[PDB]
Amino acid sequence: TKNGRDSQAKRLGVKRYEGQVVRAGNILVRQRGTRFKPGKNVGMGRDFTLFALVDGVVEFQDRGRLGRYVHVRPLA
Amino acid sequence: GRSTTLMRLPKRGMQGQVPGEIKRPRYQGVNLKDLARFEGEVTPELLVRAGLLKKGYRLKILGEGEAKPLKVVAHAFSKSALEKLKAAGGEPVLLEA
Amino acid sequence: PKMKTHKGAKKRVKITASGKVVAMKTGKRHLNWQKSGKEIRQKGRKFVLAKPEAERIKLLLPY
Amino acid sequence: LLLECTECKRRNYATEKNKRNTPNKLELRKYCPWCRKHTVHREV
RNA sequence: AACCUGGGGAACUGAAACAUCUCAGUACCCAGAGGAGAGGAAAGAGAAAUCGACUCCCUGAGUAGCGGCGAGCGAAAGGGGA
RNA sequence: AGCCAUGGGGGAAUCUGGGCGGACCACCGCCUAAGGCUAAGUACUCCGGGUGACCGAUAGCGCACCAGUACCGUGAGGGAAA
RNA sequence: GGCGUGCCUAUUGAAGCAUGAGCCGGCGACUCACGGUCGUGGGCGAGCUUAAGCCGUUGAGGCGGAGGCGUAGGGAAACCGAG
RNA sequence: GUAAGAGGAGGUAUAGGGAGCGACGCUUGCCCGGUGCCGGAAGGUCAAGGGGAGGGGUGCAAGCCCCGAACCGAAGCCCCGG
RNA sequence: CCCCGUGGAGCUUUACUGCAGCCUGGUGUUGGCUCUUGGUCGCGCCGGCGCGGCUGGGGGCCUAACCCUCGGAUGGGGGGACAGCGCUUGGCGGGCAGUUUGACUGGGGCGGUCGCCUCCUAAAAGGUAACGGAGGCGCCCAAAGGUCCCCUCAGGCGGGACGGAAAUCCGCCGGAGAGCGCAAGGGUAGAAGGGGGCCUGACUGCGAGGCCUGCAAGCCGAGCAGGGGCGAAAGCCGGGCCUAGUGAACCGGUGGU
Ligand SMILES: [Mg+2]
Ligand SMILES: [Mg+2]
Ligand SMILES: [Mg+2]
Ligand SMILES: [Mg+2]
Ligand SMILES: [Mg+2]
Ligand SMILES: [Mg+2]
Ligand SMILES: [Mg+2]
Ligand SMILES: [Mg+2]
Ligand SMILES: [Mg+2]
Ligand SMILES: [Mg+2]
Ligand SMILES: [Mg+2]
Ligand SMILES: [Mg+2]
Ligand SMILES: [Mg+2]
Ligand SMILES: [Mg+2]
Ligand SMILES: [Mg+2]
Ligand SMILES: [Mg+2]
Ligand SMILES: [Mg+2]
Ligand SMILES: [Mg+2]
Ligand SMILES: [Mg+2]
Ligand SMILES: [Mg+2]
Ligand SMILES: [Mg+2]
Ligand SMILES: [Mg+2]
Ligand SMILES: [Mg+2]
Ligand SMILES: [Mg+2]
Ligand SMILES: [Mg+2]
Ligand SMILES: [Mg+2]
Ligand SMILES: [Mg+2]
Ligand SMILES: [Mg+2]
Ligand SMILES: [Mg+2]
Ligand SMILES: [Mg+2]
Ligand SMILES: [Mg+2]
Ligand SMILES: [Mg+2]
Ligand SMILES: [Mg+2]
Ligand SMILES: [Mg+2]
Ligand SMILES: [Mg+2]
Ligand SMILES: [Mg+2]
Ligand SMILES: [Mg+2]
Ligand SMILES: [Mg+2]
Ligand SMILES: [Mg+2]
Ligand SMILES: [Mg+2]
Ligand SMILES: [Mg+2]
Ligand SMILES: [Mg+2]
Ligand SMILES: [Mg+2]
Ligand SMILES: [Mg+2]
Ligand SMILES: [Mg+2]
Ligand SMILES: [Mg+2]
Ligand SMILES: [Mg+2]
Ligand SMILES: [Mg+2]
Ligand SMILES: [Mg+2]
Ligand SMILES: [Mg+2]
Ligand SMILES: [Mg+2]
Ligand SMILES: [Mg+2]
Ligand SMILES: [Mg+2]
Ligand SMILES: [Mg+2]
Ligand SMILES: [Mg+2]
Ligand SMILES: [Mg+2]
Ligand SMILES: [Mg+2]
Ligand SMILES: [Mg+2]
Ligand SMILES: [Mg+2]
Ligand SMILES: [Mg+2]
Ligand SMILES: [Mg+2]
Ligand SMILES: [Mg+2]
Ligand SMILES: [Mg+2]
Ligand SMILES: [Mg+2]
Ligand SMILES: [Mg+2]
Ligand SMILES: [Mg+2]
Ligand SMILES: [Mg+2]
Ligand SMILES: [Mg+2]
Ligand SMILES: [Mg+2]
Ligand SMILES: [Mg+2]
Ligand SMILES: [Mg+2]
Ligand SMILES: [Mg+2]
Ligand SMILES: [Mg+2]
Ligand SMILES: [Mg+2]
Ligand SMILES: [Mg+2]
Ligand SMILES: [Mg+2]
Ligand SMILES: [Mg+2]
Ligand SMILES: [Mg+2]
Ligand SMILES: [Mg+2]
Ligand SMILES: [Mg+2]
Ligand SMILES: [Mg+2]
Ligand SMILES: [Mg+2]
Ligand SMILES: [Mg+2]
Ligand SMILES: [Mg+2]
Ligand SMILES: [Mg+2]
Ligand SMILES: [Mg+2]
Ligand SMILES: [Mg+2]
Ligand SMILES: [Mg+2]
Ligand SMILES: [Mg+2]
Ligand SMILES: [Mg+2]
Ligand SMILES: [Mg+2]
Ligand SMILES: [Mg+2]
Ligand SMILES: [Mg+2]
Ligand SMILES: [Mg+2]
Ligand SMILES: [Mg+2]
Ligand SMILES: [Mg+2]
Ligand SMILES: [Mg+2]
Ligand SMILES: [Mg+2]
Ligand SMILES: [Mg+2]
Ligand SMILES: [Mg+2]
Ligand SMILES: [Mg+2]
Ligand SMILES: [Mg+2]
Ligand SMILES: [Mg+2]
Ligand SMILES: [Mg+2]
Ligand SMILES: [Mg+2]
Ligand SMILES: [Mg+2]
Ligand SMILES: [Mg+2]
Ligand SMILES: [Mg+2]
Ligand SMILES: [Mg+2]
Ligand SMILES: [Mg+2]
Ligand SMILES: [Mg+2]
Ligand SMILES: [Mg+2]
Ligand SMILES: [Mg+2]
Ligand SMILES: [Mg+2]
Ligand SMILES: [Mg+2]
Ligand SMILES: [Mg+2]
Ligand SMILES: [Mg+2]
Ligand SMILES: [Mg+2]
Ligand SMILES: [Mg+2]
Ligand SMILES: [Mg+2]
Ligand SMILES: [Mg+2]
Ligand SMILES: [Mg+2]
Ligand SMILES: [Mg+2]
Ligand SMILES: [Mg+2]
Ligand SMILES: [Mg+2]
Ligand SMILES: [Mg+2]
Ligand SMILES: [Mg+2]
Ligand SMILES: [Mg+2]
Ligand SMILES: [Mg+2]
Ligand SMILES: [Mg+2]
Ligand SMILES: [Mg+2]
Ligand SMILES: [Mg+2]
Ligand SMILES: [Mg+2]
Ligand SMILES: [Mg+2]
Ligand SMILES: [Mg+2]
Ligand SMILES: [Mg+2]
Ligand SMILES: [Mg+2]
Ligand SMILES: [Mg+2]
Ligand SMILES: [Mg+2]
Ligand SMILES: [Mg+2]
Ligand SMILES: [Mg+2]
Ligand SMILES: [Mg+2]
Ligand SMILES: [Mg+2]
Ligand SMILES: [Mg+2]
Ligand SMILES: [Mg+2]
Ligand SMILES: [Mg+2]
Ligand SMILES: [Mg+2]
Question: What PANTHER family does this protein's entry cite (chain C)?
Fold first, then answer.
């Protein structure tokens, strides 16, 4: 035939979860598109990679129309 | 069986040359901390006679430690090393000819 | 008798004062054509190895 | 086509990529050398 | 018997194929020397205005370096001795 | 890619000579090619002796014994037992 | 009377109709040299240690520091140096 | 056969070497594009070597030393034909 | 028999690479005389004529090297600076030599495949096989990039000179079924899409901390210093909506400190 083909797995998805302590810069979640939006103290890079901008705890916030956001609540 | 980890690469320049090695003066780092141990008049003669020279072409006192008062004949002094001995001793430089 | 130092590996790998083994970053001489300034810069520095670090130690032994 | 930009009155290069037949013959884009800062870079 | 000197001189094998390379100037064929043989008083060494024939041992040193810079191969000066 | 050696071609000078110090050039220094001889320290063990945390007749040399024998092979050569 | 599928090897699997072995006796296979790395017993310690060799001895030791490892690293290197 | 030489042959194209076919009878057509072989004083390409415009190293200098264009350079291959 | 081993050997050729062998230029052995063309240094004479050394080449004759031969000849004859032979050039070169001639694989061979991306298989983290199902990549772009400002689709129905299934224009409905260079997917109009204005951050020097991971490699990145772009500014810019568009090391090329 002519089929046996596939690009190796990219291992994306939720990397960090809500209620997890995070350093500054830890990739919070790798993703295909905008399956998750940025938020409080959370930036993103060319591949739509979400990552902490501060130290603290992750939190997820669903907002229907707006979409799903993820932020880190600072504290020390 | 595959490419050995020899995939890494030789940055090392000067790695060789036909006639071989170039005869150049070798400076032995000798700290003035061990230098302060004994006291009198430290010269290359003493440090090799018993210490940390070992026929090494040159002597160069330097670094951490506290300088005892005495004449220290060496072939080179660290900038920071010249301070410690200057603050209580003489700075006898090397030869020349 | 008397192990010989592996010259090929001395010519490309310096062992640190502690016990670590360092070498230059791979893939910076040929593939190049136009890679992010990040790449060519990331490739300038040297690194540490892991397990084979111990493998390569067992050559430059007299060294 | 592989392109390489030079510096004016100096000796510095830079990574580039020009187009063969496609509308692009010369490259007069500005750039930043190590000596001093910011000077025009020709193709060459 | 072996040791020695010169003339000629392999392949297996190693390189996890193989051709440079390695095995090795080894194996061996040949001529010659002798209780030894070779070498030997600088058209030398090589960086010290230093050494002072030759051989042999220790070291230098698995250094310098050679190398499909692979596999591997691997000096000399100088220093301690006979 | 010098130094040493030399199969082929060209081809000098005698100390204002000539070789070397890793292309080449200048500087500084080294040494005197194209004839020969030279003991000792070194290598080996057929031969004699001495010693062994060496063997003790399937061991130890192939041979403790009339063995390089008997026997085998055209031959080179193989090679016991006891 | 009850119970009970040789040994070894090799195998996912052997009593195996897979391997090897007639039986006994004797012979027979992880060593040494140099270098390396970890552990361990002990000597010495910012030091530790000798190699050829020489002297002695004739189952005696001693001498011999040349040299090696260690006391500084970093850099391709010049160089700098607790950086 | 390294060579000296020897066979060919103490022969001489009615002879000697190579190849295929295979007494004898009747016959053996077409295709030289490719390959081979043969022929072709032109031309294209082509090595050492000859040449030396021009260029470089060093030196106070005369020099020493190195790089190098055009042009002359066989067979072979391209080309032309059997 | 069959397969396997980066076993062996014999054999083949337009496999690779040698070698013998043969062809070939320069040169040594290697000499004399003469004619003709080009060059070269000095002179007599207006790029040319006369002379010598040196010649390069071409044709001819010569004899004494060298070769052959003739009643053993310090010689005669034949050949002749050619051949042969030495060093060096290039070429033809299975006559000969050393070797190479992949793996997966419902036995091998034949066929097909070999790396990268998307989806499914995959059992709701990640991961996950088969010669399972099904498609792409080995690029493109100085605008298709940056930034500032501005605008928002495809389609359905109605209406309009050429045209009407579908050019372009007005209107009403139209939350995404368009567009996003290209496969597929995730994402997206509260822009990543369409359009202008200024510009070249398709910068240098770095890199806290992470994703992924056997190693090597791949990936994201705040913020710092330098100098700069767009915007009033807060601010964005270290290339393109994102996931392919590729190659360790060695050896060598060009430009610089
Ligand atoms: Mg699959
Ligand atoms: Mg996948
Ligand atoms: Mg960014
Ligand atoms: Mg982007
Ligand atoms: Mg491989
Ligand atoms: Mg440390
Ligand atoms: Mg390079
Ligand atoms: Mg490139
Ligand atoms: Mg960049
Ligand atoms: Mg840099
Ligand atoms: Mg050492
Ligand atoms: Mg071989
Ligand atoms: Mg190999
Ligand atoms: Mg083989
Ligand atoms: Mg050899
Ligand atoms: Mg020889
Ligand atoms: Mg003697
Ligand atoms: Mg003698
Ligand atoms: Mg003698
Ligand atoms: Mg002699
Ligand atoms: Mg002699
Ligand atoms: Mg000598
Ligand atoms: Mg000896
Ligand atoms: Mg030793
Ligand atoms: Mg070598
Ligand atoms: Mg060799
Ligand atoms: Mg050798
Ligand atoms: Mg010595
Ligand atoms: Mg001596
Ligand atoms: Mg000669
Ligand atoms: Mg004279
Ligand atoms: Mg005289
Ligand atoms: Mg004279
Ligand atoms: Mg004189
Ligand atoms: Mg004179
Ligand atoms: Mg010199
Ligand atoms: Mg002087
Ligand atoms: Mg000398
Ligand atoms: Mg003499
Ligand atoms: Mg003697
Ligand atoms: Mg004896
Ligand atoms: Mg018996
Ligand atoms: Mg018995
Ligand atoms: Mg006897
Ligand atoms: Mg008797
Ligand atoms: Mg018998
Ligand atoms: Mg017989
Ligand atoms: Mg036998
Ligand atoms: Mg019973
Ligand atoms: Mg098992
Ligand atoms: Mg049975
Ligand atoms: Mg059976
Ligand atoms: Mg079996
Ligand atoms: Mg068995
Ligand atoms: Mg049986
Ligand atoms: Mg048995
Ligand atoms: Mg040793
Ligand atoms: Mg040991
Ligand atoms: Mg360890
Ligand atoms: Mg120990
Ligand atoms: Mg204890
Ligand atoms: Mg020793
Ligand atoms: Mg005495
Ligand atoms: Mg004695
Ligand atoms: Mg006694
Ligand atoms: Mg050290
Ligand atoms: Mg410090
Ligand atoms: Mg011949
Ligand atoms: Mg004849
Ligand atoms: Mg005859
Ligand atoms: Mg006849
Ligand atoms: Mg005939
Ligand atoms: Mg025929
Ligand atoms: Mg027939
Ligand atoms: Mg007829
Ligand atoms: Mg016919
Ligand atoms: Mg016919
Ligand atoms: Mg016909
Ligand atoms: Mg033809
Ligand atoms: Mg042809
Ligand atoms: Mg021609
Ligand atoms: Mg020339
Ligand atoms: Mg010339
Ligand atoms: Mg000129
Ligand atoms: Mg000139
Ligand atoms: Mg000049
Ligand atoms: Mg020209
Ligand atoms: Mg021709
Ligand atoms: Mg024709
Ligand atoms: Mg294999
Ligand atoms: Mg084999
Ligand atoms: Mg094979
Ligand atoms: Mg083979
Ligand atoms: Mg053979
Ligand atoms: Mg061919
Ligand atoms: Mg040969
Ligand atoms: Mg020959
Ligand atoms: Mg010739
Ligand atoms: Mg020839
Ligand atoms: Mg001639
Ligand atoms: Mg003429
Ligand atoms: Mg003439
Ligand atoms: Mg003419
Ligand atoms: Mg003329
Ligand atoms: Mg003229
Ligand atoms: Mg004229
Ligand atoms: Mg005339
Ligand atoms: Mg003339
Ligand atoms: Mg004649
Ligand atoms: Mg004649
Ligand atoms: Mg004649
Ligand atoms: Mg003639
Ligand atoms: Mg001739
Ligand atoms: Mg020759
Ligand atoms: Mg040839
Ligand atoms: Mg061979
Ligand atoms: Mg072989
Ligand atoms: Mg296979
Ligand atoms: Mg099959
Ligand atoms: Mg196939
Ligand atoms: Mg699909
Ligand atoms: Mg899945
Ligand atoms: Mg899953
Ligand atoms: Mg699951
Ligand atoms: Mg799995
Ligand atoms: Mg399926
Ligand atoms: Mg535009
Ligand atoms: Mg775009
Ligand atoms: Mg466009
Ligand atoms: Mg409609
Ligand atoms: Mg309508
Ligand atoms: Mg109408
Ligand atoms: Mg119209
Ligand atoms: Mg869409
Ligand atoms: Mg944008
Ligand atoms: Mg639009
Ligand atoms: Mg646009
Ligand atoms: Mg724009
Ligand atoms: Mg990091
Ligand atoms: Mg890693
Ligand atoms: Mg990328
Ligand atoms: Mg400014
Ligand atoms: Mg960006
Ligand atoms: Mg893209
Ligand atoms: Mg855009
Ligand atoms: Mg992705
Ligand atoms: Mg290689």
Answer: 54S RIBOSOMAL PROTEIN BL35M, LARGE RIBOSOMAL SUBUNIT PROTEIN BL35M
